[PDB]
């Protein structure tokens, strides 16, 4: 009414700063130029010919009008202010921690560290690869095990991965997995949810009293336990081995500075969270989980691993190793970088002092509580006490704590848990004692307790082995030293603050500063995921709005924000479809149709969901073969569970048959799952639910601006129709838990909230249309040099195109890898290489890159084409030329004798923009086969 | 408490926590012991006893709060900050809220790559900030319509005082009066009067309309728009002033100049103002870059620094500081960079739209206030209304406003001022109307007023000329584009995130992340400097603590935090001394003794203070000649105002005679002023007040961690003895105002508070001691290669040493400049060149740099020594060698023919560390003489 009058007044005013104009690369003049090149009169005409009219969304998205960056920040601040930052001593796998300011500013808030993606092009990712190598080394050192990966999603899913590995290397027919009842309860739920579709029996009970009478293939033990108790697990481990089972310890890595580590205990696998290595609570995440095991299991290791290899010059160089190896894809790289830098900055001595101090404060707390006549049940503990208070006092104690802004853990009636952490001071101790005392004057003085403190553990739990002894953990302890180390690593990596990284299937669009800013507000970053609901009302509002907006964008009736990667979204989606068929009394439906062009996460997820994968052929033009789909649907009619489809296709094509395809699947009793990684071609133009999908996931780290983080973090929320809503993961019928935290990595959800709020309905749709314009523009510019492999109706692509480089191989013996490395010399990260089609490149510019930048990339590809033609025409040595020898380091050009049939200038400055700004490749071409032959995954190798 | 001290004893029993001192210091205990052994001492304490004269050694610990961790100090400051209230201030008076584009906040203001280097003395490794400054000059020239502009001044009022001084210098008449319009901002008037006082300049303050020109003036200052908002046509006043041989300065709001006819077109001779509202936080006063623009004829008369376009050795364009009576040194570079990036990001169209919108909202506001029967006094305005409400209503309106978190400006009884700004929304106007209406239901609807708005100005005030038409202001409007432009410029510059910058007299120590963080908390950054005291209690506590702490460190009885540079500190100190002599009835005391080794700011400040400078000899050993001092003090006995002394000397030496020197000055009736730029050799070891200084300034941006900013911002607080306290600048006896804001750049004072709070008394003293250790270590390493020019008693230096490079000139025809450029090829910024002694380098490592870093720098100097020896010995051409051809760009090594008697590898990788990480000089050696000959100070030239 008045808001309406004001809104109308505001529209009369001179135009304010529109975030849309900062998010888009091409402005209106640049857009018109691109349309002229394509032969289209208007953007509307292009879009009307690209998107099949039938699936087209017939109206504007119903979303709030766009806000300025300033206004959206103000609105979110108001929301955030409703959260309450307590001192949470809840524990359960999340403990407050001090992020060193230098790491917060120069990594977490530095787009040089958070904008690149998975290190597919290793020669221009040595910086984050080194940080990941440090992460692996820290994990190996602390756990006492032989190999570790470059992170998993969270503790619970890492434990589930340990269950999967154990099942896979089992010698027996055992079908049961033992889970100690004192694992964190969310871990137990994640495990059960993963075991269910596989028919694995999960036995949950006291590890002291497990009979080994039912055969098990593995066991999971918590160290220290969820209630804080430290046990000697050696005899359990011995018996498990006698019964042909592997043992996984979920072990707190900070505690391992003091306690005998899994490796020395005889454990086969160790998992856990590195959250308390300086990563914000984040109301659940993101935090890098670790996974360590024996070298003999390396081929079964989930996720990615950094290995030390050598380059063309014989110099040490890092790369992702053993890539032939779970459905995990995007992981938690940025947070693994942060955790390893926490280890670098603190060193072995600093880390140990952090744990010692925590343990001393906990022992002191215990002594004081004993004097207050409370019962203390943990014989030994690291940071966590189990306190017997009685049913009558427990609620009153919890309430008194809350009165002082403190949360404790309700365990069982009459018992309360307290977990201390790096933030705890002696003043916090006093608060706790006064809360338990029920009065401020205590029967002891704090200092007098110290003489009674024994902080030692028994010999059989006392660690003697050293850790973090490599120079990297000792050399960078001044702030200035770490600043410089971070800077030198960062300078090796080509990220979005340098040039466009046109990775097909990845959507490397703008990660706007205003979107990133709220992630580190304490009101979002400092909340424990299991804090009482009364303290998290701001997050509640954030979730409700995001659920509504993503529901409107996808057309789905219900949204789950829990899954913390695309892979997890797919898995959650298939789990809900499975639960749906069971709810109908249709237990025999386990066939999952998957087109041959699908992302590899798809069939991996289906198999984890107990489904049998049946491939569906692609036709002559690369599209889903409808006849073949129909034939297979008919054949598996009684058993059809699902079709997993990506729209537009992984070929970058808008198939007009998508509706017909969904009808066929439904006709034969299946559900339709849509992989939503290509949603950047859809938003505002079409909605998955409207054309027949029953469920989809979204990659917020592709389409909705969560940064690529060097390979994580992501979020993979799912949308479902009403008939599936009852089965969504918990926040009688739920599938259980998919992620360890109820809302996964909640803190980063503010990024996508900010994007939607600043773009508004017209803005979001314009972004999609420009993403499509730019993809078609590059295809048009390059089509005479590299065949465009797949095109849709009207000869248009969607948001990405595939360039066929196979002719270059035939004509000049030039490999796709050669072109990828040569682009480095032009100052560019290669697009997606050899997926979904071997020997090709899939290029996705997104809407955020300017025409000048698109033209530079096209000009680079055209120059490389002309270099390849020189080889073809025999105008230069086919084995010794810039393509074969790329990337060219400065040292390779400047040092030693130059024996090539081309100039150093041709090598380093092959385009004029490189003489304005030169990005230097840090190492020469990395020998891939050598690194896999000789797996070296720790700093000892460098 | 009691209990508090008991918690302290307990905490001390715990395992050692992360201590900020160990992050601040470069060398740890092991490294310190190694350095001490090379010096022939066992302990640092024993070395310090020999370095500092026993007579002046502070005999106890500093009385300061015990050190806090980074986490604890942040928490303490946060609780202080929370006592400030962030209102919507429409106070105006030269400060207007503005939106700092998040991308600029994150990637410049919060990026140590932009804030850690200092003045661009070595242009070849500072092209990035030099370009940003060129953009700033261009922006100022375009908007003001004047021919030249500098690279920033300290604030608006001092810029106007600089304009007064320029006008005085060029006047040929006997005119002694300067006219200041009474509608200038009142703080501007007081700064002007304070500067005019010691020079005997008559300041006439009155209505410009009625100034008679009867009294001869040399200059006039007019405010545009006026402080009460009114926009006047100043052409006729300017014409009359010129007929009376006076220069006219307009203090002109640069945002308003997107709409209003600019000073140049009006006939103005000089334009000054603040660029604060180009996206710089209010900062409770600063820091903000002021501008100064004038006609080309007055170019050798311009205060401050200016960037000019020149060319390098290869003929390519390159920037440098050009044209090397004002005392200004450190300016506001970082904030000039921010303001220029605001111009780059918004462009001419964007800036104009921001101004148009503000003006439209202001016209809307006035129309509504009129409908409410209020009197609107400004015929024309930009953003500021003068509202007649009557004496009775004014207090109730101001209070109602405060009730909604709004500050208005009390002008005169019965009149209220309102200045709108970039943050203002239609919702804010509604609040304003309701506050003035005294109720929420208005007799009009917001939108219905729009038909009445006439936002045009008369033709004589309407700007037609264009601005910001250069490509740089058009090409970077997407966030991705600006991110990449910022990153490219940043990459050209060598800052503290790369390597040590051992600039003598500059103290390039750690600017710790924890110190920098609170600068951008809204509770510090978003407060108007003239907000009511009730809203700034957090700042009140901050100032009181900093004053107490700096008082304890210096031994002085009172501290003024107002002066916003070392130069301003010196000037404020001499003003207080002058006022002191006046208060005793001793008007004839105007002689200022100044040793010949003093920083050039010293005599400039003395002259601005109406004093006659008398030099004092420095002896053969480099020290103040006590016999000469005594003779000059005797000779000028009855006229002696002051001695300005630096301790330790500008030669880096603790003179044992300092106390005797002070006694002599006092004996002859003078005061002692100490230049405190070398306080990094003093903290905890001696105190100026204790050995006889009456007043000193501190450079917070040297000794106390405020970052160097690429050449600003700084703060120069002064400490005085009790007998001078009455005369301190205002926040019957005060000297008036030295800075435009009562606490200068208040927001950056949190940096020094954080440093002191985290270091504690032992930490601060250890820092001083390690700074002395490291300087001595370098001197010892280098002494057989480069003569150490001045040493104290016991053969030790203080915190810096002077390397004599003059023999190289005699032997090899090598200049200091050659060595400075060659260091670039080793990855180092040169130390201080040719000051205080021509042909030498003064090296100050500070305590924050590691032994490894100190050793790399010494090793580089030793390799250069050997390169010079090769020339001396005829082993390499004396004209064609790496010293003469430095710095070497990558392109000069890679492109074209290589015709040198040394290899490209010897040029680019002269030391092993350069093969681990190489910093590339962006340009070759810049031609200095050519640049000054052909002064080009705008983007037009490059």
| Contact assignment for B905 to A895 by CB distance below 8 Å | yes
User: Which chain A residue has its CA at the smallest distance from B104's CA?
Assistant: A513
User: Which chain B residue has its CA at the smallest distance from A915's CA?
Assistant: B891
DSSP letter, residue A327: -
* Contact call for residues B115 and B335 (beta carbons, < 8 A): no
Q: What is the rounded distance in angstroms from the CA atom of residue B927 to the CA atom of residue B326?
A: 27
Residue B628 phi, psi (nearest 5): -65, -45
Q: Sheet holding A201-205: strands in order across?
A: A147-148, A289-293, A269-273, A246-251, A216-223, A176-180, A201-205
Residue B225, preceding peptide bond in cis (omega within 30° of 0): yes
Residue A74 phi, psi (nearest 5): -60, -45
Q: Sheet holding B718-720: strands in order across?
A: B558-560, B718-720, B695-698, B671-676, B640-646, B591-595, B612-616
Per-residue buried b or exposed e for A789-809, using 16+ beta carbons within 10 Å of the residue's own CB: bbbbeeebbbbbbbbbbbebb
The DSSP annotation for B178-197 comes to EEEETTS-HHHHHHHHHHHG
Contacts of residue B2, defined as CB under 8 A and 6 or more positions apart, other chains included, come to none
The DSSP annotation for B803-825 comes to EE-HHHHHHH---HHHHHHHHHH
The DSSP annotation for A383-407 comes to SEEEEE--TTTHHHHHHHHHHTTEE
Give A-chain residues touching B848 at CB under 8 angstroms. Answer: 478, 480
User: Could you tell me the sign of the dihedral formed by the alpha carbons of A681, A684, A685, A688, in that order?
Assistant: positive
| Contact assignment for A891 to B915 by CB distance below 8 Å | yes
At residue B433, the 3 state secondary structure works out as: helix
**Tokens 């998992």 belong to residue:** A271
Give B-chain residues touching A478 at CB under 8 angstroms. Answer: 22-26, 510, 848, 850
Which residue, among B359, B418, B361, has the nearest Cα to B387 in the 3D structure? B418
The DSSP annotation for A153-189 comes to S-HHHHHHHHHHHHHHT--S---EEEEETTS-HHHHH
Give B-chain residues touching A487 at CB under 8 angstroms. Answer: 113, 497-498
Q: What is the rounded distance in angstroms from the CA atom of residue A788 to the CA atom of residue A807?
A: 12
| Contact assignment for B894 to A908 by CB distance below 8 Å | yes
Other Cβ atoms less than 10 A from the Cβ of B847: the count is 24
Q: In which element (H, E) is residue A804 found?
A: strand A801-804
- Technique used by the depositors: X-ray
* Contact call for residues B308 and B922 (beta carbons, < 8 A): no
| CB nearest B850 (choices: A110, A481, A850) | A481
Q: What is the rounded distance in angstroms from the CA atom of residue A515 to the CA atom of residue A72?
A: 9
CB-based burial label for A694 (10 Å; 0-12, 13-18, 19+):
buried
Give A-chain residues touching B10 at CB under 8 angstroms. Answer: 364, 426, 446-447, 449-450
A363 is written with which tokens? 């022992």
Chain mean position to CA A273:
14
* Contact call for residues A246 and A169 (beta carbons, < 8 A): yes
| CB nearest B423 (choices: A15, A70, A905) | A70
Helices (H), B64-211: 70-81, 102-104, 112-115, 127-144, 156-170, 186-196
Which residue, among B467, B468, B466, B460, has the nearest Cα to B261 in the 3D structure? B460
Q: β-strands A269-273, A246-251: how paired? A: parallel
Q: Give the Å distances, CA to CA, from A834 to A521, A702, A817, A921, B792.
A: 40, 20, 9, 22, 70
User: Which chain B residue has its CA at the smallest distance from A77's CA?
Assistant: B522
| Contact assignment for B478 to A104 by CB distance below 8 Å | no
Alpha carbons within 13 angstroms on the beta-carbon side of residue B700 total 35
Q: In which element (H, E) is residue A76 found?
A: helix A69-80
* Contact call for residues A572 and A776 (beta carbons, < 8 A): no
Q: What is the rounded distance in angstroms from the CA atom of residue B679 to the CA atom of residue A786?
A: 66
Which residue, among B481, B531, B328, B361, has the nearest Cα to B429 in the 3D structure? B361
Q: β-strands A718-720, A558-560: how paired? A: antiparallel
Q: How many cross-chain Cβ pairs, A to B, lie less than 8 Å apart?
A: 230
Which residue, among B575, B507, B558, has the nearest Cα to B714 in the 3D structure? B507
Q: Sheet holding A671-675: strands in order across?
A: A558-560, A718-720, A695-697, A671-675, A640-646, A591-595, A612-616
B381 is written with which tokens? 């305005």
Q: Report the gap between the CA of A919 and the closest CA in chain B (Å).
A: 10
User: Which chain B residue has its CA at the smallest distance from A497's CA?
Assistant: B484
Q: In which element (H, E) is residue B320 found?
A: strand B317-322
| Contact assignment for B850 to A71 by CB distance below 8 Å | no
CB-based burial label for A610 (10 Å; 0-12, 13-18, 19+):
middle
Q: What is the rounded distance in angstroms from the CA atom of residue B625 to the CA atom of residue B636?
A: 17
CB-based burial label for B5 (10 Å; 0-12, 13-18, 19+):
exposed
């Amino acid at each position: 009414a008045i808001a309406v009058d004001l809104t109308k007044l505001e529209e009369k005013l001179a135009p304010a700063d529109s975030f849309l104009d900062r998010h888009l690369g091409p402005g209106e003049t640049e857009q018109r130029q691109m349309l002229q090149t394509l032969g289209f009169d208007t953007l509307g005409d292009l879009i009307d010919q690209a998107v099949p009219p039938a699936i087209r969304f017939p109206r504007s998205l119903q979303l709030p009008a766009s806000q300025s960056e300033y206004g959206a920040i103000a609105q979110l601040k108001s929301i955030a202010s409703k959260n309450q930052v307590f001192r949470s001593y809840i524990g359960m796998g999340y403990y407050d921690t001090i992020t060193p300011p230098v790491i917060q500013r120069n990594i977490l808030e530095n787009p040089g560290w958070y904008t690149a993606y998975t290190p597919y092009q290793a020669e221009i990712a040595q910086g984050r690869l080194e940080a990941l190598l440090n992460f692996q080394t820290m994990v190996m050192d602390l756990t006492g095990l032989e190999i570790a990966n470059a992170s998993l999603l969270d503790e619970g899913t890492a434990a589930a991965e340990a269950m999967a590995l154990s099942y896979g290397v089992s010698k027996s027919k055992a079908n049961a997995f033992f889970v100690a009842q004192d694992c964190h309860p969310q871990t137990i739920e994640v495990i059960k949810t993963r075991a269910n579709p596989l028919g694995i029996e999960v036995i949950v009970g006291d590890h002291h009293t497990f009979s080994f009478s039912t055969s098990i293939f593995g066991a999971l033990l918590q160290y220290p336990a969820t209630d804080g108790a430290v046990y000697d697990y050696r005899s359990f481990i011995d018996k498990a081995h006698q019964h042909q089972a592997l043992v996984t310890l979920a072990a707190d890595p900070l505690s391992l500075t003091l306690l005998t580590p899994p490796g020395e205990l005889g454990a086969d696998i160790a998992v856990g969270s590195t959250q308390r290595f300086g990563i914000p609570l984040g109301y659940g995440g993101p935090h890098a989980a670790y996974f360590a095991t024996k070298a003999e299991y390396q081929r079964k290791m989930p996720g990615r691993i950094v290995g030390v290899s050598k380059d063309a010059h014989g110099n040490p160089a890092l790369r992702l190793a053993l890539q032939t190896r779970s459905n995990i894809c995007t992981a938690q790289v940025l947070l693994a970088v942060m955790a390893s830098m926490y280890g670098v900055y603190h060193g072995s001595t600093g880390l140990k002092n952090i744990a010692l101090r925590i343990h001393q404060l906990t022992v002191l707390l215990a002594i004081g509580l004993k004097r207050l006549n409370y019962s203390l049940n943990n014989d030994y503990f690291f940071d966590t006490l189990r306190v017997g208070v009685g049913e009558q006092s427990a609620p009153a104690i919890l309430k008194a704590a809350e009165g002082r802004g403190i949360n404790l853990r309700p365990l069982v009636p009459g018992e309360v848990g307290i977990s201390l952490d790096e933030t705890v001071t002696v003043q916090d101790l006093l608060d706790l004692w006064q809360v338990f005392a029920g009065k401020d004057n205590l029967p002891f003085t704090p200092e007098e307790l110290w003489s009674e403190v024994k902080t030692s553990f028994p010999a059989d739990l006392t660690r003697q082995s050293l850790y973090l002894q490599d120079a990297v953990f000792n050399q960078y302890h001044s702030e200035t030293e770490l600043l410089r180390y971070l800077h030198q690593l960062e300078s090796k990596d080509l990220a979005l603050n340098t040039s466009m990284i046109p990775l097909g299937s990845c959507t490397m669009k703008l990660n706007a500063t205003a979107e990133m800013m709220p992630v580190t507000w304490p009101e979002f970053g400092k909340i424990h995921p299991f804090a009482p609901a009364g303290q998290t009302e701001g997050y509640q509002i954030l979730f409700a709005q995001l659920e509504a907006w993503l529901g409107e964008i996808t057309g789905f009736d219900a949204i789950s924000l829990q899954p913390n990667a695309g892979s997890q979204g797919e898995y959650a989606g298939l789990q809900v479809i499975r639960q749906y068929h069971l709810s109908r009394g249709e237990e025999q439906r386990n066939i999952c149709l998957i087109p041959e062009s699908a992302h590899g996460t798809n069939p991996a997820s289906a198999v984890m969901c107990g489904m049998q994968v049946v491939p569906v052929k692609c036709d002559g033009e690369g599209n889903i073969d409808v006849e073949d789909l129909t034939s297979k649907a008919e054949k598996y009619g009684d058993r059809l569970a699902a079709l997993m489809v990506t729209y537009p296709s992984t070929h970058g094509v808008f198939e007009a048959t998508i509706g017909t395809i969904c009808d066929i699947v439904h006709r034969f009793g299946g559900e339709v799952y849509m992989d939503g990684a290509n949603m950047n071609a859809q938003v505002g133009l079409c909605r998955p639910a409207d054309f027949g999908a029953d469920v989809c996931h979204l990659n917020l780290h592709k389409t909705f601006c969560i940064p690529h983080g060097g390979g994580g973090p992501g979020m993979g929320p799912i949308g479902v129709k009403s008939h599936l809503q009852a089965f969504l993961p918990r926040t009688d019928q739920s599938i259980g838990m998919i992620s360890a935290a109820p809302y996964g990595s909640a803190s980063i959800l503010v990024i996508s909230w900010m994007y939607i709020a600043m773009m508004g309905p017209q803005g979001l749709t314009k972004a999609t249309e420009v993403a499509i314009l730019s993809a078609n523009y590059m295809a048009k510019r390059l089509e005479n040099y590299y065949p465009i492999l797949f095109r849709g109706n009207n000869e248009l692509v969607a948001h990405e195109c595939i360039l066929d480089l196979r002719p270059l191989k035939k004509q000049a013996a030039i490999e796709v890898e050669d072109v990828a490395k040569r682009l480095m010399d032009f100052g560019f990260h290669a697009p997606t290489v050899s997926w979904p089609v071997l020997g090709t490149m899939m290029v996705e510019p997104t809407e955020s890159e300017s025409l000048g930048e698109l033209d530079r990339f096209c000009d680079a590809m055209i120059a490389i084409y002309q270099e390849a033609q020189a080889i073809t025409h025999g105008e230069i040595d086919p084995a010794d030329n810039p393509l074969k020898n790329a990337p060219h380091t400065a040292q390779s050009l400047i040092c030693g004798e130059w024996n090539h049939p081309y100039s150093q200038e041709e090598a380093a400055y092959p385009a004029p923009w490189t003489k304005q700004f030169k990005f230097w490749p840090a190492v020469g071409r990395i020998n891939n086969t050598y690194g896999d032959r000789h797996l070296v995954c720790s700093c000892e190798g460098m």
